[PDB]
Amino acid sequence: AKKWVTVYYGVPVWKEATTTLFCASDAKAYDTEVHNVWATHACVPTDPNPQEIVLGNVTENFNMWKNNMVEQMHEDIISLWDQSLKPCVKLTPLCCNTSVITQACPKVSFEPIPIHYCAPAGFAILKCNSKTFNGSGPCTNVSTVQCTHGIRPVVSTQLLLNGSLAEEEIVIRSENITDNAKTIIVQLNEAVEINCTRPNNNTRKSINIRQAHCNISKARWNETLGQIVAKLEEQFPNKTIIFNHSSGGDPEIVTHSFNCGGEFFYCNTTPLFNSTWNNTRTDDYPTGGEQNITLQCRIKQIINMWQGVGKAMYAPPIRGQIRCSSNITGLLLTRDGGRDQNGTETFRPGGGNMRDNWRSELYKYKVVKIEPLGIAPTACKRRV
Amino acid sequence: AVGLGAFILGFLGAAGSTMGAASMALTVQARLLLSGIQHMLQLTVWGIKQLQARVLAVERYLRDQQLLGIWGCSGKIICCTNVPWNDSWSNKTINEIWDNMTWMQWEKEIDNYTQHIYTLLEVSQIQQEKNEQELLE
Amino acid sequence: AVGLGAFILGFLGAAGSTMGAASMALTVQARLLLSGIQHMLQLTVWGIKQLQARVLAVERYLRDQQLLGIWGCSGKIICCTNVPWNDSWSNKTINEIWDNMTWMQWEKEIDNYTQHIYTLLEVSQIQQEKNEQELLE
Amino acid sequence: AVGLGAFILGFLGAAGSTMGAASMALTVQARLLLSGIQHMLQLTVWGIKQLQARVLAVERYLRDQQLLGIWGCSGKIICCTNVPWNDSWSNKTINEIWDNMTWMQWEKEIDNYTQHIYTLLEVSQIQQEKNEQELLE
Amino acid sequence: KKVVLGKKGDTVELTCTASQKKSIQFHWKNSNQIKILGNQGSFLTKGPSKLNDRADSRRSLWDQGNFPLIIKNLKIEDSDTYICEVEDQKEEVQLLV
Ligand SMILES: *[C@@H]1O[C@H](CO)[C@@H](O[C@@H]2O[C@H](CO)[C@@H](O[C@@H]3O[C@H](CO)[C@@H](O)[C@H](O[C@H]4O[C@H](CO)[C@@H](O)[C@H](O)[C@@H]4O[C@H]4O[C@H](CO)[C@@H](O)[C@H](O)[C@@H]4O)[C@@H]3O)[C@H](O)[C@H]2NC(C)=O)[C@H](O)[C@H]1NC(C)=O
Ligand SMILES: *[C@@H]1O[C@H](CO)[C@@H](O[C@@H]2O[C@H](CO)[C@@H](O[C@@H]3O[C@H](CO)[C@@H](O)[C@H](O)[C@@H]3O)[C@H](O)[C@H]2NC(C)=O)[C@H](O)[C@H]1NC(C)=O
Ligand SMILES: CCCCCCCCCCCCO[C@@H]1O[C@H](CO)[C@@H](O[C@H]2O[C@H](CO)[C@@H](O)[C@H](O)[C@H]2O)[C@H](O)[C@H]1O
Ligand SMILES: CCCCCCCCCCCCO[C@@H]1O[C@H](CO)[C@@H](O[C@H]2O[C@H](CO)[C@@H](O)[C@H](O)[C@H]2O)[C@H](O)[C@H]1O
Ligand SMILES: CCCCCCCCCCCCO[C@@H]1O[C@H](CO)[C@@H](O[C@H]2O[C@H](CO)[C@@H](O)[C@H](O)[C@H]2O)[C@H](O)[C@H]1O
Ligand SMILES: *[C@@H]1O[C@H](CO)[C@@H](O[C@@H]2O[C@H](CO)[C@@H](O)[C@H](O)[C@H]2NC(C)=O)[C@H](O)[C@H]1NC(C)=O
Ligand SMILES: *[C@@H]1O[C@H](CO)[C@@H](O[C@@H]2O[C@H](CO)[C@@H](O)[C@H](O)[C@H]2NC(C)=O)[C@H](O)[C@H]1NC(C)=O
Ligand SMILES: *[C@@H]1O[C@H](CO)[C@@H](O[C@@H]2O[C@H](CO)[C@@H](O)[C@H](O)[C@H]2NC(C)=O)[C@H](O)[C@H]1NC(C)=O
Ligand SMILES: *[C@@H]1O[C@H](CO)[C@@H](O[C@@H]2O[C@H](CO)[C@@H](O)[C@H](O)[C@H]2NC(C)=O)[C@H](O)[C@H]1NC(C)=O
Ligand SMILES: *[C@@H]1O[C@H](CO)[C@@H](O[C@@H]2O[C@H](CO)[C@@H](O)[C@H](O)[C@H]2NC(C)=O)[C@H](O)[C@H]1NC(C)=O
Ligand SMILES: *[C@@H]1O[C@H](CO)[C@@H](O[C@@H]2O[C@H](CO)[C@@H](O)[C@H](O)[C@H]2NC(C)=O)[C@H](O)[C@H]1NC(C)=O
Ligand SMILES: *[C@@H]1O[C@H](CO)[C@@H](O[C@@H]2O[C@H](CO)[C@@H](O)[C@H](O)[C@H]2NC(C)=O)[C@H](O)[C@H]1NC(C)=O
Ligand SMILES: *[C@@H]1O[C@H](CO)[C@@H](O[C@@H]2O[C@H](CO)[C@@H](O)[C@H](O)[C@H]2NC(C)=O)[C@H](O)[C@H]1NC(C)=O
Ligand SMILES: *[C@@H]1O[C@H](CO)[C@@H](O)[C@H](O)[C@H]1NC(C)=O
Ligand SMILES: *[C@@H]1O[C@H](CO)[C@@H](O)[C@H](O)[C@H]1NC(C)=O
Ligand SMILES: *[C@@H]1O[C@H](CO)[C@@H](O)[C@H](O)[C@H]1NC(C)=O
Ligand SMILES: *[C@@H]1O[C@H](CO)[C@@H](O)[C@H](O)[C@H]1NC(C)=O
Ligand SMILES: *[C@@H]1O[C@H](CO)[C@@H](O)[C@H](O)[C@H]1NC(C)=O
Ligand SMILES: *[C@@H]1O[C@H](CO)[C@@H](O)[C@H](O)[C@H]1NC(C)=O
Ligand SMILES: *[C@@H]1O[C@H](CO)[C@@H](O)[C@H](O)[C@H]1NC(C)=O
Ligand SMILES: *[C@@H]1O[C@H](CO)[C@@H](O)[C@H](O)[C@H]1NC(C)=O
Ligand SMILES: *[C@@H]1O[C@H](CO)[C@@H](O)[C@H](O)[C@H]1NC(C)=O
Ligand SMILES: *[C@@H]1O[C@H](CO)[C@@H](O)[C@H](O)[C@H]1NC(C)=O
Ligand SMILES: *[C@@H]1O[C@H](CO)[C@@H](O)[C@H](O)[C@H]1NC(C)=O
Ligand SMILES: *[C@@H]1O[C@H](CO)[C@@H](O)[C@H](O)[C@H]1NC(C)=O
Known part of the structure; x- marks a missing residue:
């Protein structure tokens, strides 16, 4: 009638763990392009027959802002870039003198390959399959996989490109939606195409070639904001939603940015974020009939690096045509709060922290280890 | 299985x-178990990864089956000991725990005591071995 | 071996x-065992196939060694039980069976009874466990 | 480990x-264990060689764990028998052997007797089995 | 609060610190919770503040666990409580002009 201690082995219990993940990708390895070359000696071929097992009635606490899978992706991408898109001059502080590297800038083809992260033997990845998962709550539909979906390592600010879309609705995720010091990641359930180009007809100016433009469907952009606003309205029900331009700081934050080949496209996004929303409908995007929002873009040679503090110079632009066709799949917004915000909330483009870009894709995954040895009370006794 | x-x-x-x-x-x-009642390089690569996972699980299994002998539970999936539950570790009854909780919830309920319990299990086994050898004389 | x-x-x-x-x-x-007294792709492919066969046999072996605990025979190659032979299952004597028959012939001789016997073995183990716990009080 | x-x-x-x-x-x-507290062809080739070594060690381990049942030591890393040391095999005391010698030195000290000892261990197990079955009647 | 007094026309360096030296996100806000400066990745950002054309930071020190806010050309209107947010901890320094 006494309760006795019983040791059980093979108990289906797991704990959070941090291990080194490996990767896989559909690299071709003969295209000379940077990601295919990197992937050739970094990642393995993908799993020809991946499997996923749904765990019935399992509730798991996920937290996208404490996810160590992010750190590994961050480090792999930095190495990918440093081994490829080499600047002519790399200038960094050393504390505080400067360390300077001078080296060649060959031009290379540069286009992302989706990379799958895979658990090593002894580890497994839990995936949250809820379509409404907000990044930090419990997930009630959890499955086990070895590998993640492939993620293209697109490096950008303000607007997240490519990667993936939400299943049903725009989902707004923030560690603390009210502290004004977190990037709000807005995942869209529909992509908005952005077409950027410099169509081989440029000249040079001196005393241009560094001039390009991007076309955004007007109808899709305005519809997209209306849906974002509806979700923001629910979060902030008595306030006006204002989309404004960026607040200042380094050009990589102030303007959008992306990289095609060696072209860094700093683009003025003011035309996308200049409006005041009343409930879910407004003006400030007049129905002129053009149906094309155009951004002015520049190609720069001296840029601030995203992988650390410092500046770097890249060789001047390609004389032919540059074409990029991307999917806007999400936004990085920050809030303008404060004691004097008398009935309004202002949202501005943010980003610059490449970890936020990677959290927007890795938020559904958690790495765990199995701990099969457990103890529970019983009614049996050992004979002694 | x-x-x-x-x-x-x-x-x-x-x-x-x-x-x-x-x-x-x-x-x-x-x-039921006892009653007894397309070719590419990636197949090689993943075949090896799958074997490594399976071999490792077997090695860990066998190791733990011998390590548990330290508490007198070697070679077992389900053991039984002579250490009392001590009540304070968990105030739930046998039926409450076994009928309503899953294993993860249970471990969460008592993970502030497992290092203590592991120590008690070792001590009991030492005393049991000592007593048996004293009897055999 | x-x-x-x-x-x-x-x-x-x-x-x-x-x-x-x-x-x-x-x-x-x-x-005797205890006394202790050319490179092509197909080598990779078949090396994997051979390992899969060996790993699988080990996993099955270990699984069955634990499953047999249900009859009180875990961890054994040769067990011994307390269930009587019951005669009708086979009218042959111990020497007749062991000296003249091979294993396949034997299984053919009694395969109309093995599901019955497996049930009896489980029942005996349950009663044995019950009796031991009743004695330990 | x-x-x-x-x-x-x-x-x-x-x-x-x-x-x-x-x-x-x-x-x-x-x-401590129980408390719980870059791609080239040669990776394929050596991955297989490493697995073969690991699989083989497991198969040998399991085989020996069952073979040792012949001396009454199946399923064990450390056994205990009822065969007296017999003195002449080694004139050292328990502390002298365990405190100062390593395992290789020890095997060198007694390798003229291990075939003899193995025989004695088998004989003891046979007598133990016989006695138990005689008692169970 | 730590109290630092400057004078109209001067430059003052107010600081936040960390035990960890590198890759630390921090923000500076005023007493009305308006952002002035902050670190996004490796980049310096500015908030919607009256100090945007005067506030700056020595980026080279960020990997030393030192995250200064520098206000150039101080005015009497800048006297306030400045709030550091570094990692999990907060710090407050009062600036008088
Ligand atoms: C989101 O995903 C999409 C697709 O899923 C990505 O879009 C791709 O972006 C790349 C980047 O440009 C683009 O690649 C070009 O395709 C052209 C089609 O034939 C190629 O001709 C071109 O190669 C030339 O330009 C490269 C620039 O670096 C050179 O390195 C290369 O050697 C070639 O250069 C020769 O030709 C040019 C012609 O003007 C000449 O000037 C040079 O001197 C030289 O002679 C690229 O391969 C893809 O086609 C895009 N895909 C699609 C479907 O459009 C998108 O970028 C992702 N988003 C982000 C932000 O990454
Ligand atoms: C909004 O911007 C888009 C650009 O993304 C405009 O679409 C482009 O419109 C031009 C108009 O001439 C199309 O040119 C056509 O190209 C085909 C190619 O073979 C050619 O045969 C035709 O004679 C013509 O030159 C261009 O293809 C088209 N771009 C795409 C991707 O379809 C769009 O028209 C702009 N909207 C408005 C209202 O202007
Ligand atoms: C190919 C890989 C296969 C896996 C190999 C795993 C090897 C790991 C060995 C771990 C040993 C743990 O440590 C040791 O375990 C044995 C297990 O009986 C214990 O031994 C205990 O049981 C045995 C048999 O019941 C008794 O003879 C002994 O008197 C008793 O103390 C020791 O008291 C303990 O110190
Ligand atoms: C890496 C792969 C390794 C192979 C893993 C194989 C795991 C398979 C587990 C099968 C379990 C079968 O089912 C269970 O077995 C155990 C085995 O002791 C039995 O347990 C029985 O023996 C143990 C120890 O002798 C006693 O503590 C228990 O009181 C008694 O009932 C259970 O009564 C039975 O329900
Ligand atoms: C996938 C590969 C896995 C590894 C497989 C290894 C198989 C090797 C089998 C070796 C058998 C050695 O030989 C045999 O062992 C058993 C082990 O209990 C001994 O059996 C002894 O123990 C058992 C259980 O304690 C009793 O039921 C039996 O009465 C007793 O004699 C036999 O007396 C001996 O003849
Ligand atoms: C939990 O998530 C899984 C994964 O999406 C859902 O199962 C999928 O359901 C679709 C429906 O057509 C199938 O096509 C998929 O093959 C299923 N996937 C798997 C892995 O089984 C599952 O239904 C979700 N469960 C709940 C309760 O929402
Ligand atoms: C995600 O949703 C969960 C609810 O499913 C939120 O967690 C709740 O937060 C409120 C805030 O006071 C608590 O009172 C609840 O108890 C929390 N519930 C649970 C189950 O923890 C969570 O904060 C949301 N996360 C995000 C990033 O928005
Ligand atoms: C989210 O951010 C808000 C704003 O900083 C936190 O709430 C503040 O908590 C401090 C703690 O002393 C209070 O003094 C403030 O008055 C609070 N502000 C408001 C507006 O209530 C909030 O706790 C944060 N939430 C989480 C989960 O960290
Ligand atoms: C991006 O959009 C602009 C318009 O906003 C496009 O320029 C127009 O193209 C049509 C096509 O015949 C011309 O008739 C218009 O006069 C052009 N407008 C201007 C102001 O010049 C531009 O071509 C689009 N970009 C791409 C790559 O097609
Ligand atoms: C960017 O270019 C793509 C094509 O590369 C445009 O998509 C095409 O738009 C025309 C417009 O009628 C459709 O008929 C085509 O079927 C579309 N192609 C595909 C593959 O869907 C896209 O609209 C361009 N973006 C912008 C903003 O104009
Ligand atoms: C976008 O943000 C800017 C910066 O705060 C706003 O501009 C300020 O508007 C107030 C309104 O009285 C002026 O007093 C400030 O001087 C303006 N700042 C600057 C630097 O001129 C701007 O109005 C915001 N846009 C929207 C749509 O609200
Ligand atoms: C983005 O483009 C807009 C133009 O649409 C720039 O805004 C202009 O900045 C000049 C600077 O003195 C002002 O005089 C104009 O009145 C502004 N125009 C409007 C419509 O406000 C804007 O600065 C550009 N932003 C970036 C980051 O380049
Ligand atoms: C916000 O930016 C948009 C970018 O399109 C501005 O829209 C243009 O406004 C001018 C004003 O005469 C029109 O001629 C253009 O045709 C509009 N563009 C399009 C694509 O229709 C918009 O006016 C700006 N809003 C505010 C409040 O300044
Ligand atoms: C989950 O709950 C349903 C409710 O009927 C039950 O049938 C199912 O077996 C449960 N799954 C698990 C793992 O217990
Ligand atoms: C919509 O406009 C009316 C006009 O007075 C204003 O009172 C109301 O607050 C506005 N709502 C939003 C969300 O801007
Ligand atoms: C979005 O486009 C539709 C097209 O008719 C227009 O009516 C609506 O007002 C637009 N939204 C904004 C914010 O202008
Ligand atoms: C944008 O999303 C659509 C959705 O199917 C996809 O087909 C298209 O290829 C995507 N574009 C890019 C650039 O990935
Ligand atoms: C466990 O039982 C002993 C018996 O005296 C008692 O002293 C001890 O406090 C109990 N453990 C806890 C956590 O109460
Ligand atoms: C333990 O269970 C008993 C049952 O009545 C209850 O009274 C007691 O308060 C429980 N202890 C705690 C700490 O809840
Ligand atoms: C097995 O023995 C029992 C003992 O009563 C007997 O009733 C039963 O019929 C026997 N089995 C067969 C197949 O005869
Ligand atoms: C069983 O063996 C005995 C031995 O004499 C024999 O008489 C009997 O007929 C046998 N039973 C059957 C069914 O053959
Ligand atoms: C087959 O029969 C011969 C006859 O002498 C015997 O020597 C041999 O060992 C037998 N083989 C088996 C498997 O018993
Ligand atoms: C072992 O003990 C027996 C006991 O009589 C003895 O005869 C034998 O000689 C001893 N072995 C050796 C090597 O002396
Ligand atoms: C064995 O040890 C004893 C201890 O005194 C010693 O006298 C004897 O000579 C030793 N035997 C041999 C062969 O050395
Ligand atoms: C070797 O001897 C040193 C001497 O202090 C000792 O510390 C070390 O552990 C020894 N190594 C082994 C294998 O015993």
Whole structure:
């Protein structure tokens, strides 16, 4: 009638763990392009027959802002870039003198390959399959996989490109939606195409070639904001939603940015974020009939690096045509709060922290280890 | 079987099942098991990765089966000891725990005591060995 | 050894040997074992196939060694139970079976009773466990 | 653990440690383990070679664990028997052997007697089995 | 609060610190919770503040666990409580002009 201690082995219990993940990708390895070359000696071929097992009635606490899978992706991408898109001059502080590297800038083809992260033997990845998962709550539909979906390592600010879309609705995720010091990641359930180009007809100016433009469907952009606003309205029900331009700081934050080949496209996004929303409908995007929002873009040679503090110079632009066709799949917004915000909330483009870009894709995954040895009370006794 | 829980070393049951239900399911499956009633490089690469996972699980299994001898539980999936539950570790009854909780919830309920309990189990085994050798004289 | 029978899980003897002869041969070989006294792609492919067969046999072996605990025979190659033979299952004597029959012939002789016998073995183990826990009070 | 000795089946300790020291170290490590507290063809080739070594060690381990049942020591890393030391095999005391010698030195000290001892162990087990079955009547 | 007094026309360096030296996100806000400066990745950002054309930071020190806010050309209107947010901890310094 006494309760006795019983040791059980093979108990289906797991704990959070941090291990080194490996990767896989559909690299071709003969295209000379940077990601295919990197992937050739970094990642393995993908799993020809991946499997996923749904765990019935399992509730798991996920937290996208404490996810160590992010750190590994961050480090792999930095190495990918440093081994490829080499600047002519790399200038960094050393504390505080400067360390300077001078080296060649060959031009290379540069286009992302989706990379799958895979658990090593002894580890497994839990995936949250809820379509409404907000990044930090419990997930009630959890499955086990070895590998993640492939993620293209697109490096950008303000607007997240490519990667993936939400299943049903725009989902707004923030560690603390009210502290004004977190990037709000807005995942869209529909992509908005952005077409950027410099169509081989440029000249040079001196005393241009560094001039390009991007076309955004007007109808899709305005519809997209209306849906974002509806979700923001629910979060902030008595306030006006204002989309404004960026607040200042380094050009990589102030303007959008992306990289095609060696072209860094700093683009003025003011035309996308200049409006005041009343409930879910407004003006400030007049129905002129053009149906094309155009951004002015520049190609720069001296840029601030995203992988650390410092500046770097890249060789001047390609004389032919540059074409990029991307999917806007999400936004990085920050809030303008404060004691004097008398009935309004202002949202501005943010980003610059490449970890936020990677959290927007890795938020559904958690790495765990199995701990099969457990103890529970019983009614049996050992004979002694 | 061995695939329960959707993983090797998930042997005793599905995650999400109660502790009690998992035990009953295990017994039924054990009876059934004893009654007895397209080519690419990536196949090589993943074949090796799959074998490494399986070999490792076997090595860990065998190691733990011998390590548990330190508490007098070697060679077992389910053991039984002579250490009293001590009440304070958990105020729930046998039926409350086994009928309503799953294994993860249970471990969360008592993970502030498992290092203490492991120590007590070792001490009991030492005393049992000592007593037996004293009797054999 | 483990290659007897020309297969893994053919451990107890050569196919075609009598049951008795196989047992004696096994004992002799066990004593000897303890006394202790060209590159092509297909090598990769078949190396993996061979490992898969070996890993699988080990996993099955270990699983069955634990499943048999349901009859009180865990961790054993040769067990011993307290269930009477019941005569009707086979009218042959111990020497007739062990000296003249091989294992396949024997299984053919009694395969109309093994599901019945398996049930009886489980029942005996349950009663044995119950009795021991009743005594320990 | 299992990597002690720098090899599989070096389980009981580092080569060069004394027999006594190795035993103590093993106990400590066992407690810790239970408390729980770049792509080229040659990767394929060596991945297979590594798996073959690991699979083989497991198969040998399991085989020996069952073969030792012939002396009444199946399923064990450390056994205990009822065969007297007989003095002449080694004139050293328990402390002299365990405190100062390593395992290789010890085997060198008595390798003229191990075939004799193995025979004695088998004989004792046979007599023990016989006695138990005679008692059970 | 730490109190630092400057004078109209001067430059003042106010600081936040960390025990960890590198890759630390921090923000500076005023007493009305308006952002002035902050670190996004490796980049310096500015908030919607009256100090945007005067506030700056020595980026080279960020990997030393030192995250200064520098206000150039101080005015009497800048006297306030400045709040550091570094990692999990907060710090407050009062600036008088
Ligand atoms: C989101 O995903 C999409 C697709 O899923 C990505 O879009 C791709 O972006 C790349 C970047 O440009 C683009 O690649 C070009 O395709 C052209 C089709 O034939 C190629 O001709 C071109 O190669 C030339 O330009 C490269 C520039 O660095 C050179 O390195 C290369 O050697 C070639 O250069 C020769 O030709 C040019 C012609 O003007 C000449 O000037 C040079 O001197 C030289 O002679 C690129 O391969 C893809 O086609 C895009 N895909 C699609 C469907 O459009 C998108 O970028 C992702 N988003 C982000 C932000 O990454
Ligand atoms: C909004 O911007 C888009 C650009 O993304 C405009 O679409 C482009 O419109 C031009 C108009 O001439 C199309 O040119 C056509 O190209 C085909 C190619 O073979 C050619 O045969 C035709 O004679 C003509 O030159 C261009 O293809 C088209 N771009 C795409 C991707 O379809 C769009 O028209 C702009 N909207 C408005 C209202 O202007
Ligand atoms: C190919 C890889 C295969 C896996 C190999 C795993 C090897 C790991 C060995 C771990 C040993 C743990 O540590 C040791 O375990 C044995 C297990 O009986 C215990 O031994 C205990 O049981 C045995 C048999 O019941 C008794 O003879 C002994 O008197 C008793 O103390 C020791 O008291 C303990 O110190
Ligand atoms: C890496 C892969 C390794 C292979 C893993 C194989 C796992 C398969 C587990 C099958 C479990 C079968 O089912 C269970 O077995 C244990 C085995 O002791 C039995 O347990 C029985 O023996 C133990 C120890 O002797 C006692 O503590 C228990 O009181 C008694 O009932 C259970 O009564 C039975 O329900
Ligand atoms: C996938 C590969 C896995 C590895 C497989 C290894 C198989 C090797 C089998 C070797 C058998 C050695 O030989 C045999 O062992 C068993 C082990 O209990 C001994 O059996 C002894 O123990 C058992 C259980 O304690 C009793 O039921 C039996 O009465 C007693 O004699 C036999 O007396 C001996 O003849
Ligand atoms: C939990 O998530 C899984 C994964 O999306 C859902 O199962 C999928 O359901 C679709 C429906 O057509 C199938 O096509 C998929 O093959 C299923 N996937 C798997 C892995 O089984 C599942 O239904 C979700 N469960 C709940 C309760 O929402
Ligand atoms: C995600 O949703 C969960 C709810 O499913 C939120 O967690 C709740 O937060 C409120 C805030 O006071 C608490 O009172 C609840 O108890 C929390 N519930 C649970 C189950 O923890 C969570 O904060 C949301 N996360 C995000 C990033 O928005
Ligand atoms: C989210 O951010 C808000 C704003 O900083 C936190 O709430 C503040 O908590 C401090 C703690 O002393 C209070 O003094 C403030 O008055 C609070 N502000 C408001 C507006 O209530 C909030 O706790 C944060 N939430 C989480 C989960 O960290
Ligand atoms: C991006 O959009 C602009 C318009 O906003 C496009 O320029 C127009 O193209 C049509 C096509 O015949 C011309 O008739 C218009 O006069 C152009 N407008 C101007 C102001 O010049 C531009 O071509 C689009 N970009 C791409 C790549 O097609
Ligand atoms: C960017 O270019 C793509 C094509 O590369 C445009 O998509 C095409 O738009 C025309 C417009 O009628 C459709 O008929 C085509 O079927 C579309 N192609 C595909 C593959 O869907 C896209 O609209 C361009 N973006 C913008 C903003 O104009
Ligand atoms: C976008 O943000 C800017 C910066 O705060 C706003 O501009 C300020 O508007 C107030 C309104 O009285 C002026 O007093 C400030 O001087 C303006 N700042 C600057 C630098 O001129 C701007 O109005 C915001 N846009 C929207 C749509 O609200
Ligand atoms: C983005 O483009 C807009 C133009 O649409 C720039 O805004 C202009 O900045 C000049 C600077 O003195 C002002 O005089 C104009 O009145 C502004 N125009 C409007 C419509 O406000 C804007 O600065 C550009 N932003 C970036 C980051 O380049
Ligand atoms: C916000 O930016 C948009 C970018 O399109 C501005 O829209 C243009 O406004 C001018 C004003 O005469 C029109 O001629 C253009 O045709 C509009 N563009 C399009 C694509 O229709 C918009 O006016 C700006 N809003 C505010 C409040 O300044
Ligand atoms: C919509 O406009 C009316 C006009 O007075 C204003 O009162 C109301 O607050 C506005 N709502 C939003 C969300 O801007
Ligand atoms: C979005 O486009 C539709 C097209 O008719 C227009 O009516 C609506 O007002 C637009 N939204 C904004 C914010 O202008
Ligand atoms: C944008 O999303 C659509 C959705 O199917 C996809 O087909 C298209 O290829 C995507 N574009 C890019 C650039 O990935
Ligand atoms: C989940 O709950 C349902 C409710 O009937 C049950 O049938 C199912 O077996 C449960 N799954 C697990 C793992 O217990
Ligand atoms: C466990 O039982 C002992 C018996 O005296 C008691 O002293 C001890 O406090 C109990 N443990 C806890 C956590 O109460
Ligand atoms: C333990 O269970 C008993 C049952 O009546 C209850 O009274 C007691 O308060 C429980 N202890 C705690 C700490 O809840
Ligand atoms: C087959 O029969 C011959 C007859 O002498 C015997 O020697 C041999 O061992 C037998 N083989 C088996 C498997 O028993
Ligand atoms: C087995 O023994 C029992 C003992 O009463 C007997 O009733 C039963 O019929 C026997 N089995 C067969 C197949 O005869
Ligand atoms: C069983 O063996 C005995 C031995 O004399 C024999 O008389 C009897 O007929 C046998 N039973 C059957 C069914 O052959
Ligand atoms: C070798 O001797 C040194 C002497 O202090 C000792 O510390 C070390 O552990 C010894 N190594 C082994 C394997 O015993
Ligand atoms: C072992 O003990 C027996 C006991 O009589 C003895 O006869 C035998 O000689 C001893 N062995 C050796 C090697 O002396
Ligand atoms: C065995 O040890 C004893 C201890 O005194 C010693 O006298 C004897 O000579 C030793 N035997 C041999 C062969 O050395």
